[PDB]
């Protein structure tokens, strides 16, 4: 509705995003730009890194892969809590709430991973570690090709130069997608997303006055996310199908 | 912890329990206590009705036993999804997550099995069926003694008259037990349980105001289940020594 109302909606989402996510993009950027993390750049520094920082995840490539999984499962919970703060979400049909989270979390994880990345690597363990891109890119069998597309996405995504207040609204828009399979009541979902989209458009105008058609460009990225997530789940399928784990542990990571 | 925060924890757990478990106690009671033309189960009380039931919905004792196992495996899956929603669980050491599930799932299954039960039998196939206590109690060799202790517990547990919003918190409390064998970091688990216990205590006072010392009574039940689970695995052990030709990989790993 009114501009005052969209601004209030943007502020509400920002305040909630700050409480929901441990490491903001602003904090990550301060770290990546040297403005201090333990650096993992090869096999020996990896072994020291587990010695040094307290990894809760514990072949080298598998351990790293298991580390991605562990953090993603935490991210899913963090995003799930975030969604409850999106005005109207908790009033949706419970099955639709589940459906929106089920298909949304992977796109949001990918999006938010870009905040922890630059062209040279990725922050881990709330910023205590930094794993270099070239070291990840050089892992064996399929694992190297599993890590690198995330960086290829993140470098393009980061050229938009979004900040946390932009991302708080963007994340909400992805959750409130009325085309997820199996939704029971599309209408209030699109009505919410319509509101979030108005708030994002106003947010990008005020926060990036010089950035022409940034709204449109961000929407284009949101579409990309669908196919890159689909290729991700396909690679996830094969790595799980070949490189075997306890049944209880496998059940934790089934989703 | 502040009341508003404990109430918020109760709503989060209740909402997540509804999302993770397809047949709630509220639905089970609606089916069992009827009033219904649409929710009424087909009743299995003997061999003939069993054979008709398969039409409607490998000695009987084995078929029934494998039917439990399949369902118990699904329950494990449901319980694992539930646990991931308990605030703080997925942030624990991965080995401890596995350990909490390994020792927790059986106690929760029995707990939730009570919801599908009355003194006369148990709902099956998401409530389409109802198998009588006496028919199970009469199965052969050890299988007859295998079903009956579930009923003995359930009759005592159901007298507490808990509803699903209570059970959601109770179930979480069970998972977050810092005394499971082999845990590496007891303290953060105990810290989660402290909050869950505070939340259970407020939930039970508000939701059962006239039910004196229900918190204490509910905790006493949580201890029993530990031995009731032991009697189950001790029975299970013998079946393995007897029925050499028969467990799901998930159930196999949970045991030992
Ligand atoms: C402790 O040890 C570590 C820790 C990490 C940290 O990673 C991440 C951190 C965050 C965060 O904090 O917000 C978010 C996503 C990742 C990550 N996920 N991932 C997947 O594959 C993935 C994705 Cl995108 C989406 C859904 C599911 C999955 C998964 F389930 F299948 F995992 C990555 C692949 C490559 C990279 Cl570089 C990062 C991620 C990374 C690490 O090694 C690189 C080791
Ligand atoms: C479709 O066909 C059916 C279906 C059932 C349905 O049962 C159950 C349903 C549920 C549920 O839906 O949440 C939960 C537990 C049981 C059940 N398990 N069980 C075991 O023994 C057992 C247990 Cl507890 C734990 C681990 C492993 C096992 C097992 F692997 F070793 F089995 C029971 C023993 C007696 C009773 Cl009465 C119920 C259960 C029951 C049925 O016959 C009774 C036939």
Curated annotation (Swiss-Prot), chain B:
Would you identify the family this protein belongs to, as annotated? Answer: Belongs to the nuclear hormone receptor family. NR1 subfamily.
Gene Ontology molecular function terms on file: alpha-actinin binding; arachidonate binding; chromatin binding; DNA binding; DNA binding domain binding; DNA-binding transcription activator activity, RNA polymerase II-specific; DNA-binding transcription factor activity; DNA-binding transcription factor activity, RNA polymerase II-specific
Induction details: (Microbial infection) Expression increases when incubated with M.tuberculosis or its lipoprotein LpqH; induction is TLR2-dependent (at protein level).
Q: Provide the gene name from the record.
A: PPARG
Q: What is this protein called?
A: Peroxisome proliferator-activated receptor gamma
Parent-protein residues present: 235 to 502 of 505
Q: What does the function comment of this entry state?
A: Nuclear receptor that binds peroxisome proliferators such as hypolipidemic drugs and fatty acids. Once activated by a ligand, the nuclear receptor binds to DNA specific PPAR response elements (PPRE) and modulates the transcription of its target genes, such as acyl-CoA oxidase. It therefore controls the peroxisomal beta-oxidation pathway of fatty acids. Key regulator of adipocyte differentiation and glucose homeostasis. ARF6 acts as a key regulator of the tissue-specific adipocyte P2 (aP2) enhancer. (Microbial infection) Upon treatment with M.tuberculosis or its lipoprotein LpqH, phosphorylation of MAPK p38 and IL-6 production are modulated, probably via this protein.
One Gene Ontology cellular component: cytosol
- Gene Ontology biological-process annotations: BMP signaling pathway; cell differentiation; cell fate commitment; cell maturation; cellular response to hypoxia; cellular response to insulin stimulus; cellular response to low-density lipoprotein particle stimulus; epithelial cell differentiation
Q: Which domain of life is it from?
A: Eukaryota
Stretches that traverse the bilayer: none
| Record location of the Glycyl lysine isopeptide (Lys-Gly) (interchain with G-Cter in ubiquitin) cross-link | 19
| Complexes and interactors | Interacts with FOXO1 (acetylated form). Heterodimer with other nuclear receptors, such as RXRA. The heterodimer with the retinoic acid receptor RXRA is called adipocyte-specific transcription factor ARF6. Interacts with NCOA6 coactivator, leading to a strong increase in transcription of target genes. Interacts with coactivator PPARBP, leading to a mild increase in transcription of target genes. Interacts with NOCA7 in a ligand-inducible manner. Interacts with NCOA1 and NCOA2 LXXLL motifs. Interacts with ASXL1, ASXL2, DNTTIP2, FAM120B, MAP2K1/MEK1, NR0B2, PDPK1, PRDM16, PRMT2 and TGFB1I1.
Motif residue range(s): 9aaTAD: 249-256
Q: Where does it reside?
A: Nucleus; Cytoplasm
Query: What cystine linkages occur within this chain?
Result: none
Q: What is its main location?
A: nucleus
């Amino acid at each position: 509705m009114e501009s005052a109302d969209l601004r209030a909606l943007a502020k509400h989402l920002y305040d909630s995003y700050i409480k929901s996510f441990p490491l903001t993009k602003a904090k990550a950027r301060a770290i990546l730009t040297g403005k201090s993390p333990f650096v993992i750049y090869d096999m020996n520094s990896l072994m020291m890194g587990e010695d040094k920082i307290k990894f809760k995840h514990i072949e080298v490539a598998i351990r790293i892969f298991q580390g991605c999984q562990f953090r993603s499962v935490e991210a899913v919970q963090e995003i799930t809590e975030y969604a409850k703060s999106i005005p109207g979400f908790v009033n949706l049909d419970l099955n639709d709430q589940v459906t929106l989270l089920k298909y949304g979390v992977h796109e949001i994880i990918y999006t938010m991973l870009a905040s922890l990345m630059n062209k040279d690597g990725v922050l881990i363990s709330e910023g205590q570690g930094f794993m270099t891109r070239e070291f990840l890119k050089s892992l064996r069998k399929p694992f190297g090709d599993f890590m690198e597309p995330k960086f290829e996405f993140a470098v393009k995504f980061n050229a938009l130069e979004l900040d946390d207040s932009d991302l708080a609204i963007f994340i909400a828009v992805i959750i409130l997608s009325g085309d997820r399979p199996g939704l029971l009541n599309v209408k209030p979902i699109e009505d919410i997303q319509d509101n979030l989209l108005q708030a994002l458009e106003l947010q990008l105008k005020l926060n990036h006055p010089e950035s022409s058609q940034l709204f449109a460009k961000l929407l284009q990225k949101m579409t990309d996310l669908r196919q890159i997530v689909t290729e991700h789940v396909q690679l996830l399928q094969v790595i799980k199908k070949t490189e075997t784990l306890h049944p209880l542990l496998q059940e934790i990571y089934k989703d």
